[PDB]
Amino acid sequence: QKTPQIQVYSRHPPENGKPNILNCYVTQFHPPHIEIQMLKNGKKIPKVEMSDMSFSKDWSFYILAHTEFTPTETDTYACRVKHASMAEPKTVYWDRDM
Amino acid sequence: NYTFRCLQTSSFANISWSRTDSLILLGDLQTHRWSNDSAIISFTKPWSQGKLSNQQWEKLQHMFQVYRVSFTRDIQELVKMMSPKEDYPIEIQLSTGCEMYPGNASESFFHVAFQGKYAVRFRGTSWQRVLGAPSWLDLPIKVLNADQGTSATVQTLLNDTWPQFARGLLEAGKSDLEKQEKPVAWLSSVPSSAHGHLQLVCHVSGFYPKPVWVMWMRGDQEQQGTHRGDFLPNADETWYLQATLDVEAGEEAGLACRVKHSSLGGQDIILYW
Ligand SMILES: CCCCCCCCCCCCCC[C@@H](O)[C@@H](O)[C@H](CO[C@H]1O[C@H](CO)[C@H](O)[C@H](O)[C@H]1O)NC(=O)CCCCCCCCCC
Ligand SMILES: *[C@@H]1O[C@H](CO)[C@@H](O[C@@H]2O[C@H](CO)[C@@H](O)[C@H](O)[C@H]2NC(C)=O)[C@H](O)[C@H]1NC(C)=O
Ligand SMILES: *[C@@H]1O[C@H](CO)[C@@H](O)[C@H](O)[C@H]1NC(C)=O
User: Which one, of B4, B5, B71, B60, lies nearest residue B36 by Cα?
Assistant: First the structure.
């Protein structure tokens, strides 16, 4: 059992009110069974696409979630991951400055 | 150099329940998809047939179809008979392909991970256990090695199919593999827990191909404290990368982020704080 690492980042320079794409890249987890949701204001976004489950040369799994979003002054965005290596879901919030 | 690779992930949970999913990649571009839900291999690129005519691709394609059903029942039979532990759950990862060297030179491989760990390889004519793998795997390995019909097929894969198919893929997708997409840079900073300290971040997204050079500069001088993050993928198979520099308060003024990429010619991106 290995714990997943979560990285959240936007495709383009974030600018409030302009449509963008938010990515959530999840790595290092084992076994490959995993649940990944992307959240807007703690609410789960409906149209979230996933890449095909792959893994690196060292056998570390990795998978890309992404969805369209329009960054804003008020809204929070987060990626929530559930995996048997963790007692609780891990949520990492999007922060355009990180 | 490009690594051609078929990556298979297989999960056996209880006596009824298994699924096998796989994809094929050439370098960092995906060329094929095979979900457990589909009966047949999909293309994910226009050139994913490489140079095979239809007849030969269909032969390779049917070969995959028989294998997936054969593979699934084999593992469960092998593990049920010889695993000194319970025969579920089983996680198998599988990587076979060849590394492409310029000038028509290749090097094939077939690697198998068992419960998340490198366990088996295929060299010459036989499967071989690797250092560190559970010793009891010796018995299923010997049983698999008595199947010379399968051994011969794998030999043909490693000696002929993968090198020749991937050379045709490489040339049918040369334009895609060599397209140039430009990076786009933007800057941000985050506080440190300590006062007077903060961390500059230079975000660089959208570039292809992958090799790129991102540094924090003060004029001529490279700031050696620059920390390059990991290459992160974008949905359009461009790349994302950020580089960070911890600086004392006030030192940010006059610092720039310099981006060297093959898509820019010699015109570096220079983006001052
Ligand atoms: C305990 C944990 C062990 C982990 C180690 C894993 C070892 C590597 C995986 C072995 C994969 C092979 C699996 C199928 C093979 O067991 C055999 O039944 C089939 C069909 O075999 C029958 O039908 C054949 C004709 O269709 C032929 O007559 C055989 O003699 C007969 O026994 N073997 C095959 O399908 C040969 C194809 C080799 C696989 C190439 C596709 C792999 C590509 C993966 C990306
Ligand atoms: C595929 O290539 C391998 C070499 O990588 C061949 O392996 C040799 O096989 C013979 C028996 O057939 C052995 O005596 C040699 O020791 C093997 N060489 C090595 C380096 O392991 C294999 O025969 C080839 N198979 C086909 C069908 O072409
Ligand atoms: C995977 O595919 C096989 C045959 O196509 C099917 O019998 C099996 O139920 C599938 N697995 C899952 C988890 O749906």
Answer: B71
Residue B8 β-bridge partners: B22, B94
List Cα–Cα distances, B127 to A60, B77, B147, B178, B219, in angstroms: 23, 17, 11, 36, 57
Residue whose CB lies within 8 A of the most ligand 3 atoms, among B16, B36, B88, for a mutation test: B36
Q: Cα angle vertex B212, ends B176, B272, to 5°?
A: 130
Q: Which fold has domain B179-273?
A: Immunoglobulin-like (2.60.40)
Method: X-ray
**Distance of alpha carbon B109 from its chain centroid, rounded?**
14
Q: Does domain A1-98 have CATH number 3.40.50.300?
A: no
Phi and psi angles of residue B80, each rounded to the nearest 5 degrees, phi first: -60, -40
CB contact at 8 A, B120 and B44: no
Write out the two tokens for A92: 């990492």
**CA B17 to ligand 3 centroid distance, Å:** 8
Question: Among all residues of chain A, which has the CA nearest to that of B91?
Answer: A31
Contact status of A54 with chain B (Cβ, < 8 Å): yes
Fold of B1-178: 3.30.500
